[model samples]
Target: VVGGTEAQRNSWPSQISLQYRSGSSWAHTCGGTLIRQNWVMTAAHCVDRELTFRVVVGEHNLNQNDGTEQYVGVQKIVVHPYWNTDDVAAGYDIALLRLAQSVTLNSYVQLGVLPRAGTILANNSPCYITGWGLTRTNGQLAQTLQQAYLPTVDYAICSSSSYWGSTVKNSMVCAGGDGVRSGCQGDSGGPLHCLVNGQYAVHGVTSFVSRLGCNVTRKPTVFTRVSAYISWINNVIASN
Candidate 1:
């Protein structure tokens, strides 16, 4: 996040670190939400490269052990069939990862509650974007998880010519276009938790930001609206 603060340890229990095996060790690549004991929802682009992947649940600091982390290998990855890497603006950037084993739930690790199918947040709904993404546009990843308060921008405004234009589709959610705090590299596939009816739910899967920069004016962070894929999520989880 460009302008963010270190998130509370248990503030976002469902947030997870998505990593890939590097030469001598693992490296954090993106953020994801633990939607189920064995399933994680993230951006399809995060797993596009052919590489070994794993997930770390209950992680607060990347470098520190923290004693609450649970590392698990990814057994299967299912990207949305309509996802096209070349055209991220066209939407369908979501993906799900099946863990080799189901993780034990604790105060630090739990499933992310998803919004009801077709549920859409009102304009300027209270929300937060949580991740270990960069602290700046071209900066390094944060050692600790970070979060920024981002209000939802309704589709009408986000799709206007001065903003994301027609690239911001209805199947996506836009938030934090203040040009100060927004999602950046390493934050893809994370969750946009929005408060609705006194409870928070996962409404979006971090998708993209302005190509010009991470925190650009009038270019809010865009996400794959999770509500639009509830049925797809159910089908995949049932048969797989």
Candidate 2:
């Protein structure tokens, strides 16, 4: 994330590093949230490429072994059927990965609590985007997990001509258009945790940012509204 600060070691325990094998080493490609012991929620675009992928749960730093990390292979991937990679602005960019084995829950590894179906955060609600994505546009990914406060921008305002315009949809959530902090590359599929009723819930799956830059004047970070897909998610998990 651009203009973010290092997150507490176990603050976002449900966060996972979705990596792909590259030259005998795993490289972090995107961020995901652990929704179940064996299921993860991420952006469909992240796994569009055919590459060997694994998920590292409890990972805080990309280059260090904190002894809490649990690496597991992905057994199956289910991307949203209507997700047209060519048109991310149309929404439906979420995906779920079934892990090879169920992971154990601990202080540093836990399931992300998701908002109820059809729930929507109020405009300007407090939220935070967390990931190891780039600290700046076209910059290298962060070594440690970083987080930035990205308040929600209601669809009405975000869809204004000067803002995201028609590109912003009600099925998605927009945040952080302050031209300072926002989600960048590699943060895709990460969690946008919003504080509701004194608790944080996973409300968004990082989708896209402005093509112009990571931190732009009016183009805030767009996310797949998790609440909009709760039914689809439940169906996938039930029949998988």
Every model's TM-score: 0.99, 0.99
lDDT of each: 0.95, 0.96
lDDT of 1 by residue, 1-240 (tens): 889999999999999999999998999999999999999999999998999999999999999999999999999999999999999989999999999999999999999999999998889999999999999998999999999999999999999999999899999999989989999999999999999989999999999988799999899999999999999999999989
Residue 186, model 1, lDDT: 95
Poorest 10 consecutive residues by lDDT, candidate 2: 59-68
| Candidate 1 Cα misplacement greater than 4 A, ranges | none
Worst 10 residues of 1 by lDDT: 209-218
